[PDB]
Design an enzyme around this catalytic site. Structure first.
Site, mmCIF file in Angstrom:
data_model
loop_
_atom_site.group_PDB
_atom_site.id
_atom_site.type_symbol
_atom_site.label_atom_id
_atom_site.label_comp_id
_atom_site.label_asym_id
_atom_site.label_seq_id
_atom_site.Cartn_x
_atom_site.Cartn_y
_atom_site.Cartn_z
ATOM 1 N N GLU A 107 1.926 1.708 -3.513
ATOM 2 C CA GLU A 107 0.808 2.207 -4.310
ATOM 3 C C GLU A 107 0.556 3.688 -4.043
ATOM 4 O OE1 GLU A 107 -2.466 -0.445 -4.260
ATOM 5 O OE2 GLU A 107 -3.805 0.856 -5.412
ATOM 6 N N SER A 163 -7.732 1.297 -2.376
ATOM 7 C CA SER A 163 -6.577 0.519 -2.799
ATOM 8 C C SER A 163 -7.004 -0.867 -3.263
ATOM 9 C CB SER A 163 -5.573 0.402 -1.650
ATOM 10 O OG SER A 163 -4.619 -0.611 -1.907
ATOM 11 N N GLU A 173 -13.904 -14.445 -5.071
ATOM 12 C CA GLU A 173 -12.637 -14.109 -5.712
ATOM 13 C C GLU A 173 -11.434 -14.564 -4.897
ATOM 14 O OE1 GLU A 173 -14.910 -11.897 -4.722
ATOM 15 O OE2 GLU A 173 -13.999 -10.208 -3.657
ATOM 16 N N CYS A 194 -10.421 -2.350 15.019
ATOM 17 C CA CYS A 194 -10.745 -3.761 15.193
ATOM 18 C C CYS A 194 -10.831 -4.166 16.658
ATOM 19 C CB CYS A 194 -9.715 -4.628 14.472
ATOM 20 S SG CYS A 194 -9.667 -4.381 12.687
ATOM 21 N N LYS A 218 -15.371 -10.349 8.638
ATOM 22 C CA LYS A 218 -14.279 -11.180 8.142
ATOM 23 C C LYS A 218 -14.790 -12.510 7.611
ATOM 24 C CE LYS A 218 -10.870 -8.534 8.335
ATOM 25 N NZ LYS A 218 -10.217 -8.162 7.053
ATOM 26 N N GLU A 256 -15.822 -11.685 4.127
ATOM 27 C CA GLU A 256 -14.638 -11.498 3.292
ATOM 28 C C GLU A 256 -14.004 -12.833 2.926
ATOM 29 O OE1 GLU A 256 -11.599 -9.051 4.984
ATOM 30 O OE2 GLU A 256 -10.443 -8.991 3.121
ATOM 31 N N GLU A 281 0.816 -1.209 0.000
ATOM 32 C CA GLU A 281 0.000 0.000 0.000
ATOM 33 C C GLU A 281 0.851 1.260 0.000
ATOM 34 O OE1 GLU A 281 -4.368 -0.944 1.920
ATOM 35 O OE2 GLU A 281 -3.546 1.002 1.325
ATOM 36 N N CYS A 297 -8.639 -2.653 3.868
ATOM 37 C CA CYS A 297 -8.478 -3.748 4.815
ATOM 38 C C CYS A 297 -9.764 -4.094 5.554
ATOM 39 C CB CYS A 297 -7.377 -3.406 5.820
ATOM 40 S SG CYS A 297 -7.469 -1.721 6.461
HETATM 41 N N1 402 Z 1 -7.288 -8.309 7.532
HETATM 42 C C1 402 Z 1 -7.004 -7.685 8.439
HETATM 43 FE FE1 402 Z 1 -6.752 -6.532 9.961
HETATM 44 C C2 402 Z 1 -5.030 -6.820 10.216
HETATM 45 O O1 402 Z 1 -3.885 -7.102 10.322
HETATM 46 C C3 402 Z 1 -6.932 -7.783 11.092
HETATM 47 O O2 402 Z 1 -7.168 -8.950 11.031
HETATM 48 FE FE2 402 Z 1 -8.457 -6.103 11.785
HETATM 49 C C4 402 Z 1 -7.662 -6.476 13.383
HETATM 50 N N2 402 Z 1 -7.128 -6.712 14.448
HETATM 51 C C5 402 Z 1 -9.709 -7.308 11.751
HETATM 52 O O3 402 Z 1 -10.705 -8.017 11.844
HETATM 53 S S1 402 Z 1 -8.900 -5.832 9.547
HETATM 54 C C6 402 Z 1 -8.910 -3.993 9.123
HETATM 55 N N3 402 Z 1 -7.582 -3.307 9.213
HETATM 56 C C7 402 Z 1 -7.017 -3.199 10.580
HETATM 57 S S2 402 Z 1 -6.621 -4.772 11.464
HETATM 58 S S1 SF4 Z 2 -13.472 -5.218 13.071
HETATM 59 FE FE1 SF4 Z 2 -14.707 -3.595 12.627
HETATM 60 S S2 SF4 Z 2 -13.064 -2.522 11.759
HETATM 61 FE FE2 SF4 Z 2 -11.828 -4.265 12.011
HETATM 62 S S3 SF4 Z 2 -12.339 -5.007 10.051
HETATM 63 FE FE3 SF4 Z 2 -13.875 -6.059 11.129
HETATM 64 S S4 SF4 Z 2 -15.314 -4.503 10.788
HETATM 65 FE FE4 SF4 Z 2 -13.708 -3.399 9.937
#
Ligand code: 402
Ligand code: SF4
Ligand code: 402
Ligand code: SF4
Ligand code: SF4
Ligand code: SF4
Ligand code: SF4
Ligand code: SF4
Ligand SMILES: [Zn+2]
Ligand SMILES: [Zn+2]
Lengths: 626, 626
Positions: free
Chosen positions: B330, B373, B420, B557, B412, B415, B327, B353
């Site tokens: 980028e 990104s 993909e 997070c 998550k 995701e 990143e 992320c």
């Molecule tokens: N993918 C990813 Fe992340 C990282 O490293 C981790 O897993 Fe978060 C945490 N803790 C979560 O859920 S997601 C968002 N970006 C910040 S931190």
């Molecule tokens: S915890 Fe909240 S902030 Fe960290 S990735 Fe999952 S949703 Fe986005």
């Protein structure tokens, strides 16, 4: 097939003596002796140049891959020694009309065809790896791949190169040299050579004279350019309506060509090839063979196709009858859910048979994807029925039947290439042949529709009604839907089956029907500009409609981009084609889609009824925002 | 595994005598004697009811399928004779927690496991057909299927029923009885029982008390309901941020549970199971085991996972370092293409992320998909690296490695379930385990992190820097990106590596950096409401930014939906977690992502450099409008 031009004996007879074999895109493939002072370009000139004066792209060394030559070696003297060991002294020439993905797919097919017999027996160890490469490349050519598949191809090339003890690997060198082409294929879903029939984009070629006709005719202002110089089409916003192709006086706008694929499919033994013919094809193809516009020459077309080698000649009007059977039921359901129902229903229902209009509504106005009918177009309905029912009951898998659509439309290629119309990489429509391409095939094969004898269309999926034949002209889809729907809504048969007001040539036509105790307000749109205007009116709410039929081409499919160029007044010729379709409708004993015996048999034997579970699963699809 | 509870000998010992075997969702599976006057519900009561007082859904008859019982037969007396011939007198009970797709997948797996040996030898003829059914059902459970696959399943069921001479076929009866569930799976991409981990939607369960906390905490107003009665989540507009889950006092909001899958994977012999731990997990999981918020117990977590049976314990902070390496490069490229470039560049760059923020920007504001990104999140970067490089070089295919992500986030799971991020139906992250689920697993296994001994994290993909550990709290991603980028832009190392102004707790924070001859204006957003506001400001143009980090949860997070509920002041607890992450950062010798030896080794051995072709192919992805 390019890799099987020369036999192994005649390739090995050139072990010494400076004679080399040359094939590919050369005008005169054969074995020639390169002189002392000669470059690669001089060799190509000795071969008579390239097929269509295309620029030189690449050159494979030997049937066993021995590297690619590029433009940097074009001006340099031909250096021998590239035929190091166990490689034939031959070169396969690639021009700007060769897709590298298709080329590598053909090379892997050639390798597998050798491995299936005693030749190239040492390649059996890499059979699985090259098969996985072929699968990845097929996914790339179908537009269903990803960027990470390139990394997978890198790993596969590394694996094959090591265990084959080869100093050149075709996958590795292709990644090195045509990475831009591969990236365009994957990210842009575009094959710039138009060899991948699933990734074809409308491209203006170098023979453009810059007259601006395409720019004037473009409904979405997708074409940029200046007077007397080359124009460019923004394929990202292109709707594939083909208006620019019709407006182009020099045929500079290309949208691919599946003629070669069709010829190979026809010439392939044990390959079942079936065709479906759009309604508008039969009233326009005769103009090139000496018939007046609107003359029905479907018998001549069937005879010509059978002479070419088509095993089964069918009609898309059968699928049109099936589509009407679905769409009238859907319209009845949504009308009942509007009067006695509530606001959850959506009106007006929009026809989904035009793929250019579907692409337009998926690109712009992406929040309206639930407004058009979920029913598939007649071509896709026919294709899925033929693949899942007809072939299944005659003992053919979907891969054993080549379903070719003869269409007057550029956007039908895109519709056939859409991924949702496929199972296990086998698409319901294998490829689309335009009316112009069929005319060229007939002319090159010596087939003259004026003097060829008449032949019947196969009745199992070719029988059709006058409601199904009027699809090819503007207002016909909604007229057939009205014919089937109003009669069942009111309970009695109309004396006059033709609904005036839906016909005509206005850009947008409004018709009000007073049959029975229910009133239907129906709209018809000619072009995509009219479609956008009526979408704006729908959003505003200034006027209301119950069902609207949308076409992308002026006059309907008879004015489609794949149709031959008209002679004289274009409006008069298109009206003559529409009147020919109307005469075909009037000449049919059955003028209602629900009376089609074959469609009724499909419903009673295989499905259950319109809008049933199986009917939805087979004949209905979904749209995706862009 | 539900089909292997009873052995064939003990099933056939019940040939006569009215004794039947019962398993499935019964509290006490076993063999009991049904009395004379007894119904199906009375049998279930004799078995002790169902696992969690769930309603009765269905009941399979015999290990060889002999039909499904439904709620209509629940109140009726248990009629014998359903065990006609060659079928064990046994019933497998299905509750409202059983997905029919998963149930049939398990049944086909059981059939294949029988066919692999002498048992059920007559089923070898239908092996290919049941394998194709399994593939179709797997595609359905993964959300990559279509409506026509139901017609294919109908044909397959017809084929298998005929050639097996069976009077009941499980595929045919499932289509007949749970067609609504199958249609929901396919069209809505929703598994209402949440057994399909790839189709999990946030669902409010019946234990809702209607306090309205979820409705108040929802950023997109996705939750409807009234006081003291059950609320409902509109999963179509849900961003999966998990704020409602954190706000819920009675844990009525469910988002699936992969605990059972994780336990089976750990207990499966010869199955390599690896885990990656998010930064925020290690500073919050100790609160349940008696540690203050912000205490780093990653050693205890690694020890507990190894005791559970995890073969390799890794860290998502390694993937965070890799993500920063991509990143920052980028961002440098887009900054250079802004000053010396032209308007074709896009600023500000947005962090990708957060999957909830990605879902939000894909659903609303779908025209901005090219602004964030293209780099994958740290979890997906780690997963793809582990599957394509680590496992490949230690001789394991992608199907032989079970990659489990331990995350504080509900989104998550979504995701990891995105298509993909998968190859040949094998997803880079097999499934996601939340912090709450890991706490429950540790408590149920007798593992106490307070007194368990310390164990090291595997260094090959677990070594990480302080820039990578600060990801778990708000502003950390952009702080690490700044740390890596500004030092290379200016050429000298900063004395103070911590960038103030990016830290704090404001909803939106603006920081201006004057290091060197380049000025960076950086924004940070806490919640999705702040993200929407800053998107509106970006569109308006009233203020400008160079790079913006977006989080969906307040505080980052550490405040994720999968985190254990805080004690005392929620803001104070979240700030304590953030300060714990900051202390971990301060305790690390290496505080820059580019200094990570393992990430550098990956770049020099496998990729080439950030933003290279291979780096793009592996570590970059694309977004799709909704
Ligand atoms: N993918 C990813 Fe992340 C990282 O490293 C981790 O897993 Fe978060 C945490 N803790 C979560 O859920 S997601 C968002 N970006 C910040 S931190
Ligand atoms: S915890 Fe909240 S902030 Fe960290 S990735 Fe999952 S949703 Fe986005
Ligand atoms: N599918 C389909 Fe059509 C039908 O029937 C035919 O093929 Fe048209 C024609 N002629 C074309 O191109 S598409 C749009 N609806 C009207 S007609
Ligand atoms: S096809 Fe229709 S849309 Fe695409 S360029 Fe030609 S005219 Fe414009
Ligand atoms: S119409 Fe054909 S020639 Fe005229 S400008 Fe457009 S493309 Fe070039
Ligand atoms: S109208 Fe008929 S021809 Fe013109 S695009 Fe639509 S479908 Fe193809
Ligand atoms: S997850 Fe976030 S978005 Fe979905 S409901 Fe709970 S709060 Fe609203
Ligand atoms: S928070 Fe939990 S309990 Fe309160 S209303 Fe929302 S869901 Fe029901
Ligand atoms: Zn191509
Ligand atoms: Zn499910």
């Amino acid at each position: 097939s390019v890799f099987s031009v020369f036999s192994e004996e005649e390739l090995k007879e050139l072990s010494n003596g400076r004679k080399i074999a040359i094939c590919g895109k050369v005008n005169n493939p054969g074995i020639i002796e390169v002189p002392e002072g000669a470059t690669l370009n001089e060799i190509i000139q000795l071969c008579g140049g390239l097929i269509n004066k295309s620029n030189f792209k690449a050159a494979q060394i030997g049937l066993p891959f021995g590297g690619f030559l590029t433009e940097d070696s074009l001006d340099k003297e031909f250096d021998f020694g590239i035929f190091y060991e166990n490689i034939a002294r031959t070169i396969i020439v690639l021009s700007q009309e060769d897709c590298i993905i298709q080329f590598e797919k053909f090379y892997i097919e050639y390798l597998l065809a050798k491995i299936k017999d005693g030749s190239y027996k040492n390649y059996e160890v890499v059979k699985e790896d090259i098969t996985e490469m072929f699968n990845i490349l097929n996914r790339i050519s179908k537009g269903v791949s990803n960027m990470r598949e390139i990394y997978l191809l890198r790993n596969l090339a590394v694996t094959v190169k090591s265990k084959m003890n080869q100093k050149h690997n075709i996958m590795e060198e292709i990644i090195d040299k045509f990475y831009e082409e591969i990236e365009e294929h994957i990210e842009e879903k575009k094959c710039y050579t138009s060899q991948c029939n699933h990734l074809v984009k409308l491209t203006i070629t170098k023979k453009c004279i810059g007259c601006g006709a395409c720019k004037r005719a473009c409904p979405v202002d997708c074409i940029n350019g200046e007077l007397k110089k080359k124009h460019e089409i923004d394929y990202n916003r292109c709707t594939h309506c083909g208006a620019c192709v019709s407006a182009c006086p020099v045929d500079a706008i290309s949208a691919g060509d599946n003629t070669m694929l069709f010829l190979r499919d026809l010439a392939t033994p044990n390959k079942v090839v079936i065709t479906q013919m759009a309604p508008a094809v039969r009233v326009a193809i005769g103009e090139a063979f000496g018939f007046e516009p609107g003359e029905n020459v479907e018998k001549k077309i069937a005879a010509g196709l059978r002479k070419l080698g088509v095993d089964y000649v069918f009609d898309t009007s059968w699928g049109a009858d099936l589509t009407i059977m679905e769409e009238a039921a859907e319209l009845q359901e949504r009308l009942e859910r509007h009067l006695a129902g509530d606001e959850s229903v959506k009106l007006p229902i929009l026809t989904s048979c035009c793929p250019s209009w579907i692409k337009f509504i998926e690109q712009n106005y992406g929040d309206m994807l639930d407004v058009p009918s979920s029913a598939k177009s007649p071509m896709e309905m026919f294709a899925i029925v033929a693949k899942e029912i007809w072939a299944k009951e005659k003992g053919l898998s979907r891969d054993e039947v080549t379903s070719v659509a003869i269409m007057p439309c550029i956007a039908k290629k895109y519709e056939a290439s859409r991924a949702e119309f496929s199972v296990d990489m086998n698409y319901d429509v294998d490829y689309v042949i335009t009316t112009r391409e069929l005319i060229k095939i007939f002319e090159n094969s010596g087939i003259n529709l004026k003097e060829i004898e008449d032949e019947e269309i196969d009745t199992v999926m070719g029988e059709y009604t006058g409601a199904g034949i009027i699809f090819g002209r503007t207002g016909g889809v909604i007229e057939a839907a009205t014919r089937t729907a109003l009669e069942k809504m009111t309970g009695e048969r109309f004396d006059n089956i033709e609904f005036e007001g839906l016909r005509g040539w206005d850009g947008f036509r409004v018709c009000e029907l007073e049959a029975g105790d229910i009133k239907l307000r129906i709209g018809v749109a000619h072009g995509l500009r009219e479609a956008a205007k009526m979408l704006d009116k729908i959003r505003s709410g200034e006027e209301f409609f119950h069902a609207i039929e949308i076409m992308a081409c002026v006059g309907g499919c008879i004015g489609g981009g794949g149709q031959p160029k008209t002679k004289g007044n274009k409006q008069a010729a298109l009206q003559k084609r529409a009147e020919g379709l109307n005469n075909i409708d009037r000449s049919k004993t059955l003028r209602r889609s629900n009376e089609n015996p074959e469609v009724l048999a499909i419903y009673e034997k295989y499905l259950d009824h319109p809008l049933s579970n199986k009917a939805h699963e087979l004949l209905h699809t979904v749209y995706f925002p862009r």
